[PDB]
Amino acid sequence: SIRLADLAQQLDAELHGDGDIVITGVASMQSAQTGHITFMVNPKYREHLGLCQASAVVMTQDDLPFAKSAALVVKNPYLTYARMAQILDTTPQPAQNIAPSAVIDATAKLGNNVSIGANAVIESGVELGDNVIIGAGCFVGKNSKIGAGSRLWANVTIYHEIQIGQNCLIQSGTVVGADGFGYANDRGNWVKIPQIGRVIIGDRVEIGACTTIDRGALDDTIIGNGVIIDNQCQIAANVVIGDNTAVAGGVIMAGSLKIGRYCMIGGASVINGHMEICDKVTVTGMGMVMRPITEPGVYSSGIPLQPNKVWRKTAALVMNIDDMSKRLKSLERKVN
Amino acid sequence: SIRLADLAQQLDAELHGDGDIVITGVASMQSAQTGHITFMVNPKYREHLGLCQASAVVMTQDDLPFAKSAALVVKNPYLTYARMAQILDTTPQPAQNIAPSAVIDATAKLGNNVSIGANAVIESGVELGDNVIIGAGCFVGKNSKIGAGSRLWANVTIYHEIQIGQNCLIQSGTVVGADGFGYANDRGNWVKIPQIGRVIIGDRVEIGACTTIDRGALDDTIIGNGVIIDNQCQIAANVVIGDNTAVAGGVIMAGSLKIGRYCMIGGASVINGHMEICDKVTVTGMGMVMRPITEPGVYSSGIPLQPNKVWRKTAALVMNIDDMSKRLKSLERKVN
Amino acid sequence: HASIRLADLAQQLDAELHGDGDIVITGVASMQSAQTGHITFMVNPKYREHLGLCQASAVVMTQDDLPFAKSAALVVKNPYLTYARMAQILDTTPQPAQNIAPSAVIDATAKLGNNVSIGANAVIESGVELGDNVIIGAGCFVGKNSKIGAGSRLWANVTIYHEIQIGQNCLIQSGTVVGADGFGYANDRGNWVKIPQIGRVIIGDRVEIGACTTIDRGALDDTIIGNGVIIDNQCQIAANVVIGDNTAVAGGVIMAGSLKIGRYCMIGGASVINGHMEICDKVTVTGMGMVMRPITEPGVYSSGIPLQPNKVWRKTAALVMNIDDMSKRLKSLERKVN
Amino acid sequence: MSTIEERVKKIIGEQLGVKQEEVTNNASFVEDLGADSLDTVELVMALEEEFDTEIPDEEAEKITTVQAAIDYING
Amino acid sequence: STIEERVKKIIGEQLGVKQEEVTNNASFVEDLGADSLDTVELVMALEEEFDTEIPDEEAEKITTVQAAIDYINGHQ
Amino acid sequence: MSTIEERVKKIIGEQLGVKQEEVTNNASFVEDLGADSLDTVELVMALEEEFDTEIPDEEAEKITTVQAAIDYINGH
Numbered sequence A, B: 001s002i003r004l005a006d007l008a009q010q011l012d013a014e015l016h017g018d019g020d021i022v023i024t025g026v027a028s029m030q031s032a033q034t035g036h037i038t039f040m041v042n043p044k045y046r047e048h049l050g051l052c053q054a055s056a057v058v059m060t061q062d063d064l065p066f067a068k069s070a071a072l073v074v075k076n077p078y079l080t081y082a083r084m085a086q087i088l089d090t091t092p093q094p095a096q097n098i099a100p101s102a103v104i105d106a107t108a109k110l111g112n113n114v115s116i117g118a119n120a121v122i123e124s125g126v127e128l129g130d131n132v133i134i135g136a137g138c139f140v141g142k143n144s145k146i147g148a149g150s151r152l153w154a155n156v157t158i159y160h161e162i163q164i165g166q167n168c169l170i171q172s173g174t175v176v177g178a179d180g181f182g183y184a185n186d187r188g189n190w191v192k193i194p195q196i197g198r199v200i201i202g203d204r205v206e207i208g209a210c211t212t213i214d215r216g217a218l219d220d221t222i223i224g225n226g227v228i229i230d231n232q233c234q235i236a237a238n239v240v241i242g243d244n245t246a247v248a249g250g251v252i253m254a255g256s257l258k259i260g261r262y263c264m265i266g267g268a269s270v271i272n273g274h275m276e277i278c279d280k281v282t283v284t285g286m287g288m289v290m291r292p293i294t295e296p297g298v299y300s301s302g303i304p305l306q307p308n309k310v311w312r313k314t315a316a317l318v319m320n321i322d323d324m325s326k327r328l329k330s331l332e333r334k335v336n
Numbered sequence C: 001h002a003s004i005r006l007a008d009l010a011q012q013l014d015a016e017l018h019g020d021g022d023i024v025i026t027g028v029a030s031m032q033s034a035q036t037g038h039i040t041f042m043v044n045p046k047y048r049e050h051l052g053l054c055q056a057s058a059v060v061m062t063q064d065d066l067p068f069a070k071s072a073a074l075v076v077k078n079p080y081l082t083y084a085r086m087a088q089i090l091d092t093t094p095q096p097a098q099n100i101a102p103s104a105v106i107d108a109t110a111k112l113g114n115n116v117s118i119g120a121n122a123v124i125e126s127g128v129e130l131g132d133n134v135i136i137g138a139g140c141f142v143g144k145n146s147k148i149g150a151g152s153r154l155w156a157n158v159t160i161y162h163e164i165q166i167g168q169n170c171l172i173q174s175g176t177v178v179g180a181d182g183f184g185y186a187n188d189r190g191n192w193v194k195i196p197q198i199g200r201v202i203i204g205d206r207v208e209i210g211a212c213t214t215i216d217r218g219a220l221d222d223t224i225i226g227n228g229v230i231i232d233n234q235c236q237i238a239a240n241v242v243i244g245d246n247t248a249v250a251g252g253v254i255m256a257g258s259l260k261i262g263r264y265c266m267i268g269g270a271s272v273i274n275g276h277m278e279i280c281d282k283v284t285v286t287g288m289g290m291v292m293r294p295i296t297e298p299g300v301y302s303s304g305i306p307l308q309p310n311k312v313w314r315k316t317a318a319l320v321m322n323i324d325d326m327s328k329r330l331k332s333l334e335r336k337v338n
Numbered sequence D: 001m002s003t004i005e006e007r008v009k010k011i012i013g014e015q016l017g018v019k020q021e022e023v024t025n026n027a028s029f030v031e032d033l034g035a036d037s038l039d040t041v042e043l044v045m046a047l048e049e050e051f052d053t054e055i056p057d058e059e060a061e062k063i064t065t066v067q068a069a070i071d072y073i074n075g
Numbered sequence E: 001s002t003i004e005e006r007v008k009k010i011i012g013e014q015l016g017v018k019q020e021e022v023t024n025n026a027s028f029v030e031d032l033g034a035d036s037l038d039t040v041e042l043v044m045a046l047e048e049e050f051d052t053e054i055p056d057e058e059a060e061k062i063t064t065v066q067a068a069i070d071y072i073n074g075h076q
Numbered sequence F: 001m002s003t004i005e006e007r008v009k010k011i012i013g014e015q016l017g018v019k020q021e022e023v024t025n026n027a028s029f030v031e032d033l034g035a036d037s038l039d040t041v042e043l044v045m046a047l048e049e050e051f052d053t054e055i056p057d058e059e060a061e062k063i064t065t066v067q068a069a070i071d072y073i074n075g076h
């Protein structure tokens, strides 16, 4: 709960309306009621302000003539939404101080104000920085290090010799530092290659749920500062991801891929290994990334849905495209 | 075990043969022996029935003439198979009793006949309805509510403020309620958007293993009654799934997708967000769902496997289809 | 901290040592990171000119590489396989657990063989049998009557359901679930009705499974994983899949139910495989394969159209979707010309 | 050298990976011969090349059985 | 019946909008909800109806209704 | 105006995206010029277009170097 005026100043936003309005939380435009602040990003919805029951709306200067309530004026409403949602966040912490059911090795080294949830297991040689929070049921493996302010939700698995930077956040079911898929073939038999590299995660990295990040074979898997990784992703051994890159859900990356800075990898993409993708590349969803990308820009693949009856003929024709090609050449020749 | 006549009654099946036969379990038509009941749905296996060693076979009225054992005659053998396997289910429960090693907050509310497995962690304000069963190692977050008869297998993670209906079932490794993938871009830096919406799961919902269903940003992610979801699915923030829809394994959905009732989404499909799929739509496997679907029916995408050497030529010709298109136009001219 | 004389290591690797046998090797490292005391290896001849840069105490290589060597060299026929062996000899990986944790919950009916270790807060159900030298990591769950053979190991937070069988010397990474219900449901006028999955999962010997993989139990008969199979992360192996010996499945593969895969296959990552059908021995499917149909002959098979610049792709997509029209105009022109 | 029945049945057998006992005249491709979603379409293409003809989509959708295939080819 | 009207019809049919939304100043993307394949498809539609071939460099400059009309007019 | 050798090397260069100074007669498409399995197929197709020829695959699998590409066209 906060007064609109205080909220505006903390948001460094221009107050337009009764500053004594009490804001109790954030809500969507369609759901907002009195006590709620909301925001508008698209000018398509200016009419909808006339139907919105929020006590306040975050908008731009050109939106203000359309306002029907108190307003906060800023250059970037969506970034302002992010900040005010942080101010008014209702999300609890994964844990509150140290649980008596936690199993913590005597050689673990804890900073100040560390929290550790029920039944979490902390191995030997582990170091947890100040204000670190380990959720219920986690495992943190031998000699791993977790930087100050970092937090793990319930049931996250961290293997041994892993390094996590400051202020990171990892959601449940995620596994960091499992063995890379490393095997040599001996006349058809697979022979295991121990993966003795690590994973190094920078500062302010956020990783979603049920994502797996493998440790490197010899050198390390590396996740740069400010990277965001969604759910269900596979980041294979020795992948390197540049600062501030975003990876949407269900992405599968092959080993030894290097991705540059400020990339956006669309969900469900599949990325070949032992190759590089430069800075400022966007791959749209379900992208089949077979080759390196040397120039920034947007790249795509995939043939989208069709009615089943249509698709059947489409697929059959594509599979015989070489015969179409020949019939074409044979026809060009006949004409000329 | 059960007398065949007593089973036939419970299955509302018309019995042909000895009702005093003792049935001990269900088995496949090729594995069945004395004391087992099996079923036939494909009429091709009619002349095979002499080979089957089951004590009884569920089949249709049209199949009856080929019967070579006691026969249960019904309209829908497969549905009848489901019911009789339920009657003869050998599957144990995730837990019985409340485990001494479970950690249960003092403010949690438990109904009658609740079971909670070893080392499960139940947060403050949690409500568990009658006959709820929580598997070993589960986490159920603050203020979440699980309706009567619902069951969680081991190592399921439920976040805070989650609501689950009655008679639901969730397999191991599934994470319900993690933060949706919400970030605002600040000049290339990502700024976290707290996800303060929830997940609302209806009655009779079944969810597979290692599936992730994210909580909404402001409004809720909603799973309708009678929905079934397979393993490894990603259900993004603010997805709404209509009643009785089925989602096969490995499906990836973007945020704010609305899916109607009675849909079937084939495994490994990828579905774009901020759009709607109407009722009664089927998407076949590996579907690339880029656009809204406004009419019921079956929809498909994808070009299937070919021998690698054939595939190389196919891919090269497709990637250069524009040139092929142009060569076609010019040739259409040269004979006009 | 391993410490081994290079001559003793060469002997164990059946390598021909060119250089000082008294050199003390303490571990394996990459060419770029190796220090004094490290051994490394080289497979690509492109790295021959790089050898001078390398600080390793020894390099595993072939006879043809030898004239380029600038350090003690171990000559073998297969440097990559030799790397695997020497990595194992000098492995630093810890164990998932040692001894039996007091916080573990172990049913009194569970049978434990010799030298079994069980991590903190792991849960072992009734009737479970764990063979000699089995290691169960922290926070695992092992379900009723399940059997895990000698030398097998689970990392932390693995889930094994009831009636599961796992052979000897297997390894399963964290977050993997073995034996969940297959996706089995009968439709009754639009309502799904659950079909209990009372088959099992039978895993052979020397099987390695990655993290967050799910292997469902069979509906009636069993899901079966052959000996020596390797499975990577985030795979879905559906009910009643059968995978033949020594097959490899890379990351994120989705397999439909009742699929049968033969021996010595290589299934590329992110492939999707239809069910109730069969893939024969010695088939390779490249990455992102859309495996719709049975494969009856050994060889390599592929699908997919790779990335293009977005502007280009838009035109490619539109043209492919309109390919029937193209086919008709082509036929139209053929009959006109003739 | 083969009669039309023998030719048509041979094409179907090759496409559906079935034997010549299976290939009765009453046989439906999907029900009896286990064809998939692309097989019928591709089978229709197999006929257009073997017979050096051109089957209109209008006509093509009625070929679902062995006898219907043979019947079109006799024309 | 005119070029302006035939163009405006195809656009609406293509983008699923009413003939009154198709203002001359309307942007396909910003006003008419066109997606990544919509404009390519629209261009293909116009090429067929008006019997012309539009080069890729002009096509990427046809982002509005009037620009489309202007192009067809100038090309027969 | 351009020799056969020049035309072949120009296409190898544009297809593999390498500097003409790297297109050495001894260079292997894969090991030296970094061609993937699709690249070599696209390379052959481009050669067929430039010289208006057809390459039977049994010959095409023999085209793995700069010299081999020239030799096929050459009859050398």
Ligand SMILES: *P(=O)(O)OCC(C)(C)[C@H](O)C(=O)NCCC(=O)NCCSC(=O)C[C@H](O)CCCCCCCCCCC
Binding pocket: A230, A231, A248, A249, A250, A265, A266, A267, A268, A283, A284, A285, A286, A300, B180, B181, B234, B236, B237, B252, B253, B254, B255, B270, B271, B272, B273, B288, B289, B290, B291, C310, E035, E036, E037
């Ligand atoms: P046009 O813009 O040039 O091309 C149209 C396409 C390619 C369909 C489109 O632009 C696109 O790629 N859209 C979405 C890409 C993406 O990753 N969207 C998700 C944003 S984040 C969010 O939704 C959170 C959620 O958890 C994400 C999980 C994975 C989302 C799956 C991606 C779906 C891609 C659609 C393929 C047709």
Ligand SMILES: *P(=O)(O)OCC(C)(C)[C@H](O)C(=O)NCCC(=O)NCCSC(=O)C[C@H](O)CCCCCCCCCCC
Binding pocket: A308, B230, B231, B248, B249, B250, B265, B266, B267, B268, B284, B285, B286, B300, C182, C183, C236, C238, C239, C254, C255, C256, C257, C272, C273, C274, C275, C290, C291, C292, D036, D037, D038
């Ligand atoms: P035709 O019918 O018009 O089209 C042919 C195709 C598209 C191949 C076919 O109809 C199809 O879509 N088959 C299966 C789709 C599906 O989701 N099947 C799963 C049933 S449930 C099951 O097997 C349990 C398992 O847990 C599911 C895991 C996901 C597997 C998805 C495989 C998709 C195969 C498509 C082509 C490679």
Ligand SMILES: *P(=O)(O)OCC(C)(C)[C@H](O)C(=O)NCCC(=O)NCCSC(=O)C[C@H](O)CCCCCCCCCCC
Binding pocket: A180, A181, A214, A236, A237, A252, A253, A254, A255, A270, A271, A272, A273, A288, A289, A290, B308, B312, C232, C233, C250, C251, C268, C269, C270, C286, C287, C288, C302, F036, F037, F038
């Ligand atoms: P050409 O050789 O005939 O065809 C070109 C292709 C098909 C691209 C090529 O030959 C190929 O398949 N190379 C192998 C790619 C591969 O599978 N790399 C991964 C090997 S093991 C690995 O890194 C372990 C990791 O943990 C999981 C792997 C993830 C899946 C890899 C995706 C495949 C990329 C295909 C095109 C986008």
Ligand SMILES: [Cl-]
Binding pocket: A250, A268, B250, B268, C252, C270
């Ligand atoms: Cl996937």
